[PDB]
Each structure stands twice: as C-alpha cells, then as structure tokens.
Amino acid sequence: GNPLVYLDVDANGKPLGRVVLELKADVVPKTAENFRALCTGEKGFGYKGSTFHRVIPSFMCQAGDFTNHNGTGGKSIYGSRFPDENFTLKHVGPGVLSMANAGPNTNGSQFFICTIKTDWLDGKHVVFGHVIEGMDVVKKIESFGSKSGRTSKKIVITDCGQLS
C-alpha cells in the first residue's frame, strides 16, 4: 500500500508531537519515493534535523531544505532536481502535502503542508500526499509563522521515518 511516514517536530527545543503523512505512491510514485527515502534517511541524507524555515499563517508550512536550512537548498534522492511527475492531485484544503519548487521541473526535497485550500498552486506544484494524523501539530507550526514566512520559534524535525 501507500507509504505512511512521520515527522516528529520540536519548537524551540520542546516537542510538539508527530505529523503522519500518507504518500500517494499510487498517483505519484517517483515523488512519493523521494519523500519516503528522505524520511528514513536510507540514502545517507534526509530530513532528520532540518527545519520548517518558511511558515505563513493561513497558507502553508514549508520545510525540507536540509542542506542550507533557508530555502535555497535541498536535493532529491535522484539528483539535485527531478521533473514534475503530474499535477493530478489538487490542493484541496488543509493537510495537503505538496512539493515546493522554483519553477517547472525543479523538485528537490523542499515540501509544504497546506493549512488552507490553495487552488492557485494546482498545475504548478506536485501534490503527493496528505496529513493522516497531527493536524494539531501543523496548526502549532503555522502559529509560529508570519506574513513574511520568517518563523518566530525554531521549528525542527527532530526525527522522521517510515511507519509502513
């Protein structure tokens, strides 16, 4: 079946809890596999210890830059970037998991979790899963963002991996 993965998240060094994500490998296998392996760290790099560096209330929480920790970096398990697999899944509401990018076919490791429907990203960002459990953690993260995206607490993925 589709992978279930987890992110355990701290804010200012204290645990907020766990976000569980379903990865829609049935729709976007290459994109799901990238995220799954970055969660386990099995290629020798991944999300463990990295941050939510850009968080905008009433929009989304972005993370996954495990190389530069600021939005300029990250890399996929395939190489630095990989193509947009498809745009079939849509940004339908809070809890959608989608790939950040800097234009067509620039997926790396950065991702975002929506806290609202973000329909204008349909056809531009590859949606590849959604929150199964832990929206409360997502709302805490969101509450530490700002209009500019700068966070007001240090939000760290302390642990991550695959549940199934």
Ligand SMILES: CCOC(=O)c1cnc2cc(=O)[nH]n2c1C
């Ligand atoms: C994977 C591509 O990531 C981005 O394009 C990106 C990453 N981080 C930030 C912080 C910010 O304020 N803007 N920002 C952007 C546009």
